[PDB]
Design an enzyme around this catalytic site. Structure first.
Site, PDB file in Angstrom:
ATOM      1  N   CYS B  59       9.841 -20.544  19.903  1.00 27.99           N
ATOM      2  CA  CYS B  59      10.746 -20.970  20.964  1.00 27.99           C
ATOM      3  C   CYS B  59      11.078 -19.804  21.889  1.00 27.99           C
ATOM      4  O   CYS B  59      10.652 -18.675  21.689  1.00 27.99           O
ATOM      5  CB  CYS B  59      12.055 -21.505  20.404  1.00 27.99           C
ATOM      6  SG  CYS B  59      12.905 -20.244  19.423  1.00 27.99           S
ATOM      7  N   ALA B  62      12.696 -16.797  20.215  1.00 18.73           N
ATOM      8  CA  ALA B  62      11.679 -15.907  19.664  1.00 18.73           C
ATOM      9  C   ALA B  62      11.119 -14.986  20.740  1.00 18.73           C
ATOM     10  O   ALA B  62      11.007 -13.768  20.538  1.00 18.73           O
ATOM     11  CB  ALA B  62      10.560 -16.723  19.013  1.00 18.73           C
ATOM     12  N   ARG B  93       8.993  -8.947  12.521  1.00 13.44           N
ATOM     13  CA  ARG B  93       8.032  -8.355  13.443  1.00 13.44           C
ATOM     14  C   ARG B  93       8.057  -6.839  13.333  1.00 13.44           C
ATOM     15  O   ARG B  93       9.131  -6.230  13.407  1.00 13.44           O
ATOM     16  CB  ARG B  93       8.342  -8.777  14.884  1.00 13.44           C
ATOM     17  CG  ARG B  93       7.362  -8.236  15.897  1.00 13.44           C
ATOM     18  CD  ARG B  93       7.669  -8.981  17.159  1.00 13.44           C
ATOM     19  NE  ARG B  93       6.841  -8.773  18.332  1.00 13.44           N
ATOM     20  CZ  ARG B  93       7.248  -8.108  19.409  1.00 13.44           C
ATOM     21  NH1 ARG B  93       8.438  -7.505  19.392  1.00 13.44           N
ATOM     22  NH2 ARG B  93       6.488  -8.091  20.513  1.00 13.44           N
ATOM     23  N   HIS B 192      10.059 -14.786  27.253  1.00 14.62           N
ATOM     24  CA  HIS B 192       9.685 -13.532  27.915  1.00 14.62           C
ATOM     25  C   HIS B 192      10.289 -13.452  29.307  1.00 14.62           C
ATOM     26  O   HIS B 192      10.840 -12.425  29.720  1.00 14.62           O
ATOM     27  CB  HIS B 192       8.168 -13.394  28.069  1.00 14.62           C
ATOM     28  CG  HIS B 192       7.387 -13.482  26.807  1.00 14.62           C
ATOM     29  ND1 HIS B 192       6.080 -13.928  26.789  1.00 14.62           N
ATOM     30  CD2 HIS B 192       7.694 -13.155  25.528  1.00 14.62           C
ATOM     31  CE1 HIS B 192       5.619 -13.870  25.553  1.00 14.62           C
ATOM     32  NE2 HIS B 192       6.579 -13.410  24.768  1.00 14.62           N
TER      33      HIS B 192
HETATM   34  S1  ICS Z   1       4.319  -9.592  23.340  1.00 13.40           S
HETATM   35 FE1  ICS Z   1       3.495 -11.569  22.714  1.00 13.40          FE
HETATM   36  S2  ICS Z   1       2.358 -13.854  19.395  1.00 13.40           S
HETATM   37 FE2  ICS Z   1       2.228  -9.803  24.192  1.00 13.40          FE
HETATM   38  S3  ICS Z   1       4.911 -13.062  22.050  1.00 13.40           S
HETATM   39 FE3  ICS Z   1       3.763 -12.465  20.296  1.00 13.40          FE
HETATM   40  S4  ICS Z   1       3.386  -8.104  19.872  1.00 13.40           S
HETATM   41 FE4  ICS Z   1       1.261 -11.977  19.786  1.00 13.40          FE
HETATM   42  S5  ICS Z   1      -0.630 -11.990  21.040  1.00 13.40           S
HETATM   43 MO1  ICS Z   1       3.005 -12.326  17.768  1.00 13.40          MO
HETATM   44  S6  ICS Z   1       1.735 -12.028  24.073  1.00 13.40           S
HETATM   45 FE5  ICS Z   1       2.816  -9.197  21.725  1.00 13.40          FE
HETATM   46  C1  ICS Z   1       2.563 -11.023  20.992  1.00 13.40           C
HETATM   47 FE6  ICS Z   1       0.955 -10.978  22.217  1.00 13.40          FE
HETATM   48  S7  ICS Z   1       4.884 -11.366  18.757  1.00 13.40           S
HETATM   49 FE7  ICS Z   1       3.104 -10.168  19.279  1.00 13.40          FE
HETATM   50  S8  ICS Z   1       1.393 -10.672  17.983  1.00 13.40           S
HETATM   51  S9  ICS Z   1       0.832  -8.790  22.700  1.00 13.40           S
END
Ligand code: ICS
Ligand code: ICS
Ligand SMILES: [Ca+2]
Ligand SMILES: [Ca+2]
Ligand SMILES: [Mo]
Ligand SMILES: [Mo]
Ligand SMILES: [Mo]
Ligand SMILES: [Mo]
Ligand SMILES: [Mo]
Ligand SMILES: [Mo]
Ligand SMILES: [S]
Ligand SMILES: [S]
Lengths: 522, 477, 522, 477
Positions: B59, B62, B93, B192
């Site tokens: 969401c 997140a 994370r 974002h």
């Molecule tokens: S921020 Fe995005 S889902 Fe760019 S929300 Fe997600 S730490 Fe993924 S593909 Mo989790 S747009 Fe980063 C991402 Fe990529 S959390 Fe990380 S791996 S490079």
């Protein structure tokens, strides 16, 4: 840099001098960081009694909670039914988190769907999401049953679950006879265990509320077992094992062992095992119903007593010696089956282990937390072991539950230094283990950061963590363990005495300093 | 497979759906054509998830708390609402940082307003104001507070922006209101955007009238690297070995002061385009700062990025660029020599979030592997525009893939390795298919840069070639 | 001094300043101790490759052995028979040691008698001791059988056990029908596992050698199981459980699980359970005989093959995935019973744990020691996990066994850095873990002193001990564990991966130094 | 019980035995009369063990290697013979020391010549000579070697005395041959005597013509304290607080130089009479050093010993003695105040080796407990002479008790607590009787002195009153 034959991951890569130098330049150049002296000063202040008094005056801020929200428990309850898909009406971010949280604890797939309510549903309600969602779920994942709970969005905007599901059937999105039990599971009431209670009571209502006229108590000669929110596979198993050793016919209502422990044999099994729909429909014909974790099964208890007319026994969680004894004796009384020689011997083997290990366990001081029934069973067993519960924390506990634990403590001289905390979090507990230091913590993985904090003050202040509870994310396969019955008591006892002895070995490993007490035999 | 065979696979998988879902999902599945520049002719994206199909998306909370704001280490971020959201996202994370947690940094803590029914019925603004005072007392070294709104905040009519303005003025503290409620948007993506707009509106301009920072022509910011397992540190080291000064990291290991210094840099280096292009476009418009996309996955892309970046500066930076390349050449060549023979020809399917599904392809190809399918949870069509030229002809693309689709695609394509997330991992291991987490790096990493390529190569080899995968069938069956 | 409410035992009492000052004065006044710089200099030298070369040149000195002597195994074997008293003809000091050594490992009574041969027996022989000892033992402890082994005194002086026993019966010290099997168990041959083999073959001969004429192979439709020297209760239990699960009729020959695990219920039971005399007498009628630890059952194998005419299958110890598979397939072939779905699922659950934990296990380097079958099975399973056995030590191993383990190692890329050592001791192993440092040791409690030594050189040189083997004296109740079968493999896997993760947590606990990698989730 | 009831108990238990064993065991069982001085008329001791009756005794090797020599910390002690003896006795006894193990101290190591059959057939003297060279190379800081003979050494006719003298002369090294083979004597006792004679013959006279040691009028040696859990240290601190100088400790935490300095002291303080009276008598006869027995178990005996020891010196030592007693008075009175109410009137049966079955009685009585039965594995009649007055009238005495006897006596007398060894512990716990190890102190201690009394009291309370003892009967029985 890397050496190809000894590749370094983040630890210890970033301890290389060039990375160290770069991180100092980043700090000094651009972070405008507080001086280290100030950081030390403030850290020390957070270990004091003065800080604890301010900490315990919090009324609005929670820091590092020791609880989760209702629909997490609803999903775990739903998973215990045969070919059942957990379905959380509401916003999809919740389901990604529920799945991931259980994924990390069980190291298993966790199947659960959302109906993805968005801003549109925020304005118009989520009825269309329910109709399409139920149709899409049933067609795609072919469950035999969909068990519906809610996210807080759907609760705040007041979606009428019953009307939405009925309209889904009346308009042909799903067949009229397809089973869709539901429960409201608001995250701002109670905790994850409340969601389990609510979801179970909804499923029980679905299969029995309107079919009671042909029911007769005791006519199927079984005892129903309701496990509650349970995240140790060994706890489902030990209950089934003991009842089967006594020849007691039983029905375990919500049984997710199989689907939380499928084999890696080349096939993914979305569903496995579980309580059957016929087992729920027939459950009023049982002799009685035993609640394994009664302090979060109050709504279920009201329905089983009020509608099934079962005289639900007043039993504690079967943890430790006394309460496992009481559980077996009550089961023997209800079923007519004697307690067999095999379980009597198992009991005496636990007592034997207690005699063997009592000198190392005596007087050891623990801080501990978790869910209400788990915590009180752990407190009870610690007292049986001659240990001293000191800081007893149940973030999601209530005043009646605290009264019950305080009485258990009062009944034992080993409870004289114990205080029970309800509504307090792990930032409260961190102060307590600084100002009134115990020997160990018993808790879930979030306790590791408390241990880290205590060690920063100095090795002599470190409070090591013993991982028992939920979630456990930083060790592998402890979810396979047992904490109930004699078997669970033996595992807890073994873990506790060997934690004590491992720590003594660490403290006596220093040659010509402390290794005079580094004994071969303990 | 032929393009026709991949197309038949898509159509066969779609047969299970009711027609409404079927018509929708057909638009989000495609056979790649690397000559296509306008991906909208082949695939659509950034739409609602069809209900009940078990999307892998999260969401907006997140995307805002978990992704953009959470990593900023010397601020305290409040998960504002009921207890669930901040608990499931606490320390999930691996956005790594240097600090003294609970004292001057707070990343892996869970601060929350733990809404009860009284707060739903009567509003949480009074609770939030009290909470802010308690934060200030108990964590005096925090350098700012963000308020991450969970679902109920907007629904009950709370006004966190006025609490933030009033308390911030009263306490002379930066307090950032973020309206990232999970019902907004369709995925992490709108989170974002909401998060960059909150940075823009409440933090980024703080030093607009402050001339005391001595800039240099080599000042850059790393934009959109969240330092997963140290990724940003193994990127930063190369940029500074090449003679540049990394003023800020957005937001892995990031501090609030380096965000406020970022309008002073000469070039914004964008790694995650999806999550940070918004603030990058803002700083171009407001401060005239150019931004450029780069890729530090594997040696080929890292070398190309270092040279592209160095060309924006001068001969001295270009000379250092070539020295950095010369320094690391024997290291990654040794990685390739060891691991490429172990991985040559192996076929991988990916499913990740918004950047890595295209951006790691080169690193796999540097080890002789083939990416035969890829897709994203929440990418937009400008992401797919950047993807189609990176993927081979007649490979499979999937946007917001359902669990059913992904399982069925995998069963037909039979890759040697799957790279995806935690909700996918244990499904495919049980089918006997080696799996690597491409979000958390399966608790390994870094993977960025030359030092990260070594770890990436070691990791793909240890899993793909592990002896366990030969043992799933019992010898009596 | 002591504070009555916080009493200190030796640690940390002797860290008080007045004790420190006193010990300093004792050292400087009267101990004529080497200077600390010289002690540091010699310690550092003992960690070097130069020292290791001299160490491995030893021909006469043994230091910290990893084996015991024959009669210890004979006693353990005898304890596995119903109402049987182990009787060691010879010196009583031995029996005190045997009992104490098993007491400390099992934390259980261990019943065993001597006939207390004294110095006069060096000239006159020990016949009178045997006459009176057999009569006294039978009258006083009322065994149904007395199983006779020997101490090294009785071996050197050449006491004729057969004649002594026959004369005891002829002269009425014990009834002529009373079972008195015997074996010679010289401590200067082999090791404790050899004593087990010798004692079992003596009991097997006693009940079958002169009664073979009416025997028919296969006529009782069972499989005999000979466990060998086995000190984990779970290992007896898992073999019996898996065979029952298959519906395979079986006879476990030497079964001490009951007498090594009696309950604490108010009475002491000197005997419990055990293989019956009828089972040994009937054993030649089995379909076949399976040897669980064949590398120390060679005399038994020759008797079972040469006399009972069983075609003993060539099976490795059932440890790890492959060798448990082979065991169940062979039992299935012999018995005609299919492997049931429950065991197939158990197998797939072990493989699932392997896939879950393979990334932390990969490439980890181990030093390990123990008895030959245990050691080769541990090596085999480590290879299956993608681990690197590096130092493999078997003090009581032989050249043929070494050739077999080298062939196992050569068949796996994970064996490329492994060396197998026979006839070497734990002072040898100490050098190896300094000069070629592994990640962990897997061994018995004597390993703790190697860990202590490695930490003394520095925290970055410390090799932690993982306790698997015999004896384990400094932790409680690990003898209840399992190492055989899928169950044992699950337990070993869990302990290995969680040892890796516990050490990583210790290494990343340092705040603002290494705790960037102190992950909640692993 | 009454005297007649105890006598009847003895006769009933004896009924199980064959006549020869019955007649013998009757002589080793008695009802105490505290007026007896000639114990041999009511109980005999230090005789052979009747075969097959499960004696608790060990052997002369345990008495020499395990008890007397093994604790000497800077020497290397070879268990000479097969591998068993040294392995079962490795680190079994908690004779505590300060040192760097493997470097300058060796106590918890197991050095052995690990005899194989060729050593039995050809003799071990060659092997022993080579072993000595290997010891010198690999452990160059050792200050002497002892050779502890196991059973086969004398049976095969090896000459370790010749090896010791030859190698000792060759290497300018003290190598002590000890003929403590397990077949000698009847128990641990003869091992003590043999070990004493070996000290006398090979070590003790080395400094006879060395006058460089600076004597004082207050020099003493602690003779016969093996520092179990630190027992000797918590005795030493009191003696030196009383103004005395403890030149040596035999042999807990003992060094070879301390032993060689012992002929220089003014008074030998004998705690374990059984194991060391032999060398004490030798030192009086040869050096004119008087000796005296003392007892540091519990405050009453410790106060009495300190006063009796001080009375052997001048008024200044006597004044410091009363100061020591005054300092510790509030400490042991707090112990009594806390624990005596928890233990008042409880009844104990003891079975130990050759000293503690009488030495610990006063400490139990200081806690209000009653010792209703006691006995020894290997005491002589001069030990029993010292026991009669220490025990109440009509209590039970047992010498070299059999396993059967001890079980039957306990079943009839029903003590509240049993204090004995590791081979007894787990029998009586299963019967529901609290048990304390009175050799190893159940991994606790020290128990000597004032500081030891606090630990002893806590330990007896924690076990006798443990909640576990009320749980042995399942509630359905
Ligand atoms: S921020 Fe995005 S889902 Fe760019 S929300 Fe997600 S730490 Fe993924 S593909 Mo989790 S747009 Fe980063 C991402 Fe990529 S959390 Fe990380 S791996 S490079
Ligand atoms: S030496 Fe003796 S058996 Fe005096 S052999 Fe034994 S450490 Fe006992 S009663 Mo173990 S004559 Fe010491 C003894 Fe007493 S080993 Fe210890 S406790 S005071
Ligand atoms: Ca799994
Ligand atoms: Ca026991
Ligand atoms: Mo499409
Ligand atoms: Mo603003
Ligand atoms: Mo751009
Ligand atoms: Mo007597
Ligand atoms: Mo001598
Ligand atoms: Mo004397
Ligand atoms: S944390
Ligand atoms: S040792």
């Amino acid at each position: 840099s890397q050496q190809v034959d000894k590749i370094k991951a983040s630890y210890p890569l970033f301890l290389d001098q060039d990375y160290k130098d770069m991180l100092a330049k980043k700090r000094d150049g651009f972070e405008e960081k507080y001086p280290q002296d100030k950081i030390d000063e403030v850290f020390q202040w957070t270990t004091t009694k003065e800080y604890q008094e301010l900490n315990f005056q919090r009324e609005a801020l929670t820091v590092n909670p020791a609880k989760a929200c209702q629909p997490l428990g609803a999903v775990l309850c739903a998973l215990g039914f045969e070919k059942t898909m957990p379905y959380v009406h509401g916003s999809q971010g919740c389901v990604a988190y529920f799945r991931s949280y259980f994924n990390r604890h069980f190291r298993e797939p966790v199947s659960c769907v959302s109906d993805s309510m968005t801003e549109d549903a925020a304005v118009f309600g989520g009825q269309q999401n329910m109709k399409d969602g139920l149709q899409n779920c049933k067609a795609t994942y072919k469950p035999d049953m969909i068990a519906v709970s809610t996210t807080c969005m759907a609760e705040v905007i007041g979606d009428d679950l019953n009307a939405f599901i009925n309209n889904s059937k009346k308009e042909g999105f799903i067949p009229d006879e397809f089973p869709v039990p539901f429960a409201h599971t608001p995250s701002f009431v109670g905790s994850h265990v409340t969601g389990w209670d609510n979801m179970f009571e909804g499923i029980a209502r679905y299969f029995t509320l309107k079919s009671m006229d042909d029911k007769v108590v005791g006519s199927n000669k079984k005892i129903n077992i309701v496990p509650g929110f349970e995240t140790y596979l060994g706890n489902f198993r030990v209950i089934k094992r003991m009842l089967s050793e006594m020849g007691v016919g039983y029905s375990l209502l919500s049984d997710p062992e199989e689907v939380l422990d499928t084999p890696a044999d080349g096939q993914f099994r979305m569903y496995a095992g579980g309580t059957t729909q016929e087992e729920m429909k027939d459950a009023p014909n049982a002799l009685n119903t035993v609640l394994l974790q009664p302090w979060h099964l109050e709504k279920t208890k009201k329905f089983v007593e009020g509608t099934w007319k079962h005289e639900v026994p007043k039993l504690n969680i079967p943890m430790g010696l006394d309460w496992t004894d009481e559980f077996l004796m009550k089961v023997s009384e209800i079923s007519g089956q004697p307690i067999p020689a095999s379980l009597t011997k198992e009991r005496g083997r636990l007592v034997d282990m207690m005699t063997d290990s009592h000198t190392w366990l005596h007087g050891k001081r623990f801080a501990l937390w978790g869910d209400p029934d788990f915590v009180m069973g752990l407190v009870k067993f610690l007292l049986e072991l001659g240990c001293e519960p000191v800081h007893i924390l149940c973030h999601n506990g209530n005043k009646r539950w605290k009264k019950a634990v305080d009485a258990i403590l009062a009944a034992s001289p080993y409870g004289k230094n114990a205080t029970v905390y309800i509504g307090k979090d792990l930032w409260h507990l961190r102060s307590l283990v600084f100002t009134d230091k115990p020997d160990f913590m018993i808790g879930n993985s979030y306790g590791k950061f408390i241990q880290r904090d205590t060690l920063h003050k100095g090795k002599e202040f470190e409070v090591p963590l013993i991982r028992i509870g939920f979630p456990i994310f930083d060790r592998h396969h402890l979810h396979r363990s047992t904490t109930l019955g004699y078997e669970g008591a033996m595992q807890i006892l073994t873990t506790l005495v060997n934690s004590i002895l491992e720590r003594l070995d660490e403290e006596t490993r220093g040659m010509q300093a402390t290794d005079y007490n580094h004994d071969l035999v303990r | 497979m032929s393009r026709e065979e991949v197309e038949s696979l898509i159509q066969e998988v779609l047969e299970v759906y009711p027609e409404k879902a079927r018509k929708d999902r057909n638009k989000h599945l495609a056979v790649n054509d690397p000559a296509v520049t306008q991906s909208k002719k082949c695939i659509i994206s950034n739409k609602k998830s069809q209900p009940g199909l078990m999307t892998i998306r999260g969401c907006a909370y997140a995307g805002s708390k978990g992704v953009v704001w959470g990593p900023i280490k010397d601020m305290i971020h409040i998960s504002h609402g009921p207890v669930g959201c901040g608990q499931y996202s606490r320390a999930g994370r691996r956005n790594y940082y240097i600090g003294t947690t609970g004292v001057n940094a707070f990343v892996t803590m869970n601060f929350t307003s733990d809404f009860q029914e009284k707060d739903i019925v009567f509003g949480g603004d009074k609770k939030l104001a009290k909470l802010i005072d308690e934060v200030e007392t108990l964590f005096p070294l925090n350098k700012g507070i963000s308020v991450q709104s969970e679902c109920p905040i907007g629904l009950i009519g709370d006004d966190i922006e006025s609490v933030s303005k009033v308390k911030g003025a009263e306490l002379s503290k930066t307090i950032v209101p973020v309206r990232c409620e999970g019902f907004r948007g369709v995925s992490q993506s709108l989170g974002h955007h909401i998060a960059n707009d909150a940075v823009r509106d409440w933090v980024l301009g703080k030093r607009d009238e402050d001339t005391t920072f001595a800039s240099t022509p080599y000042d850059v910011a790393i934009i959109g690297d969240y330092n997963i397992g140290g990724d940003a540190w193994s990127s930063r080291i190369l940029l500074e070995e090449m003679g540049l000064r990394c003023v800020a990291q957005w937001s892995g290991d990031g501090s609030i002061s380096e965000i406020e210094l970022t309008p002073k840099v000469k070039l914004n280096l964008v790694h995650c385009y999806r999550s940070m292009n918004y603030i990058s476009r803002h700083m171009e418009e407001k401060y005239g700062i150019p931004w450029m996309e780069y890729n530090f996955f594997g040696p080929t892309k890292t070398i190309e990025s270092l040279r592209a970046i160095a060309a924006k500066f001068d001969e001295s930076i270009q000379k250092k660029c070539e020295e950095v390349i010369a320094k690391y050449k024997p290291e990654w060549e040794a990685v390739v020599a060891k691991y490429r023979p172990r991985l040559e020809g192996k076929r991988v399917m990916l499913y990740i979030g918004g950047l890595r599904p295209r951006h790691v392809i080169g690193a796999y190809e540097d080890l002789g592997m083939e990416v035969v399918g890829t897709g994203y949870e929440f990418a937009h069509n400008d992401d797919y525009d950047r993807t189609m030229k990176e993927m081979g002809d007649s490979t499979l693309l999937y946007d917001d893939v359902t669990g059913y689709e992904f399982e069925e695609f995998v069963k037909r394509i039979k890759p040697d390795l799957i790279g995806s997330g935690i909700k996918e991992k244990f499904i495919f291991q049980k089918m006997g298919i080696p799996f690597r987490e491409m979000h958390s790096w399966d608790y390994s990493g870094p993977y960025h840069g030359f030092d990260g390529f070594a770890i990436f190569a070691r990791d793909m080899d240890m899993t793909l070639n592990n002896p366990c995968w030969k043992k799933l069938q019992a010898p009596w069956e």
